[PDB]
Design a protein around this nucleic acid. Structure first.
Lengths: 411, 555
DNA sequence: CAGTCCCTGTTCGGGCGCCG
DNA sequence: GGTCGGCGCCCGAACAGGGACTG
């Protein structure tokens, strides 16, 4: 008996038409059970071929979770409804969330099933369930309530959500609460003990309105990976050539970098393994360049109107470096991950884990998901990435093949 | 007109566009008799109705012969309709494969009749399905009809039938969960582990459940005894095989011919292991006329004779057993070609296949092997929903060396080494640190965009030097040529310094094959070496002899 | 500076097979 | 014959995006 908020696509664009990729047995059996149940609870209803729209669907298991979770790739639908959740019903991003000692994430996607969807918009939430060996044709459904993973869901539920959070925000005013998609980020400077208790106070505060999860973050302990130069006491021709090449590449970020006195050490046609003494003018150009890498880059600042972009570099031995930027060489943040799950055995699992950590960090700091430049072939990624996804959102990505140049981000 | 027991799918046109208005083709007198005989039969059964001048729409119509029957099939040229109708999302996402079937006690196959003619069309949409039937005389105005069912030839007919058929089977499948029904259009593979007595009861229950909706299951197409003919195969209680494949024996081969030949060879490769179409597809490159007759090359005649030799012997596949693991083994058939067999017990292949796509101008066997594994993985998930275990002709240490040092993300699922030559290996390894006591070569190359002329050479720490003039070249070919020279005129261990990101990006990827002859010559010299160290320095920065050799190859 | 040229990779259009 | 839909393969042509040098 709730009134539906009218929603429309952005002008001059049709709904998503993305084919369903093949799914494993454990995934298809999980979607059937969920979908029949959601059909029995009236959340979804079967449709037919007259609906030309479709969106891929698969299932996941969150970190240390045994129950399956239905996930829809509405990235194409969200691109095609961007004016709604940014212009009309936008959500402000608290700049203090990233400064909290502990931030916890809570899946609140079950609440969106309480609000009906606009009748004219249900046509675009269509999806297809495949069968193993194509035993039966695609069993299609469409959403009759607010779908999980749609950018328009937290915007419609925003008015309802704020009213639920007001009794808790009043008792706890110093607590920061942000909502992105199907997740709720709660950050506090409290001690780790009384922090988790306040989480349970909220959890029971949301259970009484008709709604459980747990993943802790510590944004104050997030570090950045600077560009560092080796501290060798004996330098060979090759060492100086690698040093000049790396300093030359770093000059695009710190204009103050100079390689004039070091290039003078590379005048003759010398053997690579030959030891070269550092001149006095070079030892100072080396020490001055080390200080410029300690200074922050001039003129870097976040722009809310620009899309985030993230690049990831595989450094081997379980090492992965990343940089987030909006304009090239103006990196808003750099970093490095090591020892993730699947280290030393699986690179797709590590690459999948790295994207999730990076995206999670981008949500805490700016409230946006970056478009990734993944260091992997397109066919390799599209085959395995679903087997390691443990998150309710899906960032955008593209595939690059940049041969290692020099080791700019890792020693 | 009575009401059809199946619910009707609402179909619209695209907004702003009217129905089709196309004139009828001139038809041969033998086809008009077949149409009026079939038209006149379908209006009696309520499948087409007469229309007057109030219907301003019209579309062509014709008829083709049915395979191995005197009956004719009615088809309508809805090309102008299909352009303006709404788009449909097809629910056939692929084709079932027998390798995915499980051993069932009893098996039954049936095929319904007048399938498209047993499912109604939307009431408000029948007006746009107007067509004319030309009489035996060109002056006769002709008879105009409109469809009441799914017209054979309309783009929505298959889509609507598949979805309507599933909706009718859902109440049966909901009451009989242990019954497996493979639904593909009009064909229903039914199987169960129930005893043979209660099997035939549930069969009869389905033929009556389908009868309540106007779907007839004729006893002519009823199949109760093995072998079963399902989807072009022969299903036996323990094995299966494809229906016999016939290749053309043309003495004079045309382009189109190769295409039917190639098409059937790919179809045969799913159970017949070892089919190669490398040299036969090399006949389809750069050809324009589907009919420019083409002579068979010596390598293609050999390839054809081998394939004919595989088709003489009988082969068969087995069914999927969920209790035992899935296994897939790959071999390197030829240069750029791969084959695989998927099985659960040794020599009892569920299915076979091949992968031979050339991705990129420069590649190696390890890349192609990784591409092959991924193709097998996806195909396996389609049919069995799981990833097989892999037996690969690559050493464990070989693969560990590759993926750990490659800059891209790469991975292979659970696999084990199988010692089946030819083994996939890395033909050379670039050192990670410069080689002590090895001559150091500073290479560079440049060319002119107008003259297309350039130089390429090197300067070493021992005083060695060379510069070579080059004609009809580019900047990239020269930087590669400079590295080829340093490899030729060096010992077994050599350090090479370049400023070419292009050349360095190709070599570090450890390719063993390339479309460029210059790369293949560089590869051949790299294999002869024991230790090779490559390094990059920025150009125009006065680095070592890289600025001295930049000034020698400037012109 | 902005324009090419050189190179490489991807996407699509069009032939066949197979099934219905 | 010159219907529709699905999936697969092979090819070439058009598209497209980055790097070095010139303009």
């Amino acid at each position: 008996p709730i009134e539906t908020v009218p929603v429309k696509l952005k002008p001059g664009m049709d709904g998503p038409k993305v084919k369903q990729w093949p799914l494993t047995e454990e995934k298809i059996k999980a979607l059937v059970e969920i979908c029949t149940e959601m059909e029995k609870e009236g959340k979804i209803s079967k449709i037919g071929p007259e609906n030309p729209y479709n969106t891929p669907v698969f299932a996941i298991k969150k970190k240390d979770s045994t129950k399956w979770r239905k996930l829809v790739d509405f990235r194409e639908l969200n691109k095609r409804t961007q004016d709604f959740w940014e212009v009309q019903l936008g959500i402000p991003h608290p700049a203090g969330l990233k400064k909290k000692k502990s931030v916890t994430v809570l899946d609140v996607g079950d609440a969106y099933f309480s609000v009906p969807l606009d009748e004219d918009f249900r046509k675009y939430t269509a999806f297809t369930i495949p069968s193993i060996n194509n035993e039966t044709p695609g069993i299609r459904y469409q959403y009759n309530v607010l779908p999980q993973g749609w950018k328009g869901s937290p915007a419609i539920f925003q008015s309802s959500m704020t009213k639920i959070l007001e009794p808790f925000k009043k008792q706890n005013p110093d607590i920061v609460i942000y909502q992105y998609m199907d997740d709720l980020y709660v950050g506090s400077d409290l001690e780790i003990g009384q922090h988790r208790t306040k989480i349970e106070e909220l959890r029971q505060h949301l259970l009484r309105w008709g709604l459980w999860m747990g993943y802790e973050l510590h944004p104050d302990k997030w570090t950045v990976q600077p560009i560092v130069l080796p501290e060798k006491d004996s330098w060979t021709v090759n060492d100086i050539q690698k040093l000049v090449g790396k300093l030359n590449w770093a000059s695009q970020i710190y204009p103050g970098i100079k390689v004039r006195q070091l290039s003078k050490l590379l005048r003759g046609t010398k053997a690579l393994t030959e030891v070269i003494p550092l001149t006095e003018e070079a030892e100072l150009e080396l020490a001055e360049n080390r200080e410029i890498l300690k200074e922050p880059v001039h003129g870097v600042y976040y722009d809310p109107s620009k899309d985030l972009i993230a690049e990831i570099q595989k450094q081997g031995q379980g090492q992965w470096t990343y940089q987030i930027y909006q304009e090239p060489f103006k990196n808003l943040k750099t970093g490095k991950y090591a020892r993730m799950r699947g280290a030393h055995t699986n690179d797709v699992k590590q690459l999948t884990e790295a994207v999730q950590k990076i995206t999670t960090e981008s949500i805490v700091i700016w409230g946006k998901t970056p478009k990734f430049k993944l260091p992997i072939q397109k066919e390799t990624w599209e085959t395995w990435w679903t087997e390691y996804w443990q998150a309710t959102w899906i960032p955008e990505w593209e595939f690059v093949n940049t041969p290692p140049l020099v080791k700019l981000w890792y020693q | 007109v009575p009401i059809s027991p199946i619910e009707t799918v609402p179909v619209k046109l695209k907004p702003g566009m009217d129905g089709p208005k196309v004139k009828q083709w001139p038809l041969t007198e033998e086809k008009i008799k077949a149409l009026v005989e079939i038209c006149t039969e379908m209006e009696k059964e309520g499948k087409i109705s007469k229309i007057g001048p109030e219907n301003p729409y019209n579309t062509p119509v014709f008829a083709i012969k049915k395979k191995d029957s005197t009956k004719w099939r009615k088809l309508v040229d809805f090309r102008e309709l299909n352009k303006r109708t709404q788009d449909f999302w097809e629910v056939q996402l692929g084709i079932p494969h027998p390798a995915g079937l499980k051993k069932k006690k009893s098996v039954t196959v049936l095929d319904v009749g007048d399938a498209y003619f047993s499912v109604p069309l939307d009431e408000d949409f029948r007006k746009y399905t107007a067509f004319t039937i030309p009489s035996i005389n060109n002056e006769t105005p002709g008879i105009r009809y409109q469809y009441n069912v799914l017209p054979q030839g309309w783009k929505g007919s298959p889509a609507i039938f598949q979805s309507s058929m599933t909706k009718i089977l859902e109440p049966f499948k909901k009451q009989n969960p242990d019954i497996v029904i493979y639904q593909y259009m009009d064909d229903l593979y039914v199987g169960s582990d129930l005893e043979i007595g209660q099997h035939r009861t549930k069969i009869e229950e389905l033929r009556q459940h389908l009868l309540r909706w106007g779907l007839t299951t004729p006893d002519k197409k009823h199949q109760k005894e093995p072998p079963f003919l399902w989807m072009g195969y022969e299903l036996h209680p323990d094995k299966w095989t494809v229906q016999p494949i016939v290749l053309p024996e043309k003495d004079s081969w045309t382009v189109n011919d190769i295409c039917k030949l190639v098409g059937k060879l790919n179809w045969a490769s799913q159970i017949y292991p070892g089919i190669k179409v490398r040299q036969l597809s090399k006949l389809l490159r750069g050809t324009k006329a589907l009919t420019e007759v083409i002579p068979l090359t010596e390598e293609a005649e050999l390839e054809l004779a081998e394939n004919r030799e595989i088709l003489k012997e009988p082969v068969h596949g087995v069914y999927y057993d969920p209790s035992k693991d899935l296994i897939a083994e790959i071999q390197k058939q030829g240069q750029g070609q791969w084959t695989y067999q998927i099985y659960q017990e040794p020599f009892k292949n569920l299915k076979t296949g091949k992968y031979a796509r050339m991705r990129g101008a420069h590649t190696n066997d390890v890349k192609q092997l990784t591409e092959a594994v991924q193709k097998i993985t996806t195909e396996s998930i389609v049919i069995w929903g799981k990833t097989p275990k892999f037996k690969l002709p690559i050493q464990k240490e070989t693969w560990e060396t590759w993926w750990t040092e490659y800059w891209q993300a790469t991975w292979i699922p659970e696999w084990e080494f199988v010692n089946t030559p030819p083994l996939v290996k890395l033909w050379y390894q670039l050192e990670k640190e410069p080689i002590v006591g090895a001559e150091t070569f500073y290479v560079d190359g440049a060319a002119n965009r107008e003259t297309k002329l350039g130089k390429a050479g090197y300067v070493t720490n021992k005083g060695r030097q060379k510069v070579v003039p080059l004609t009809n070249t580019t900047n990239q070919k020269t930087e590669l040529q400079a590295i080829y020279l340093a490899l030729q005129d060096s010992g077994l261990e050599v350090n090479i310094v370049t400023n070419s990101q292009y050349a360095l990006g190709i070599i570090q990827a450890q390719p063993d094959k390339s479309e460029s002859e210059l790369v293949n010559q560089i590869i051949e010299q790299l294999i002869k070496k024991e230790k090779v160290y490559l390094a990059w320095v920025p150009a125009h920065k006065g680095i070592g002899g890289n600025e001295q050799v930049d000034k020698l190859v400037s012109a």
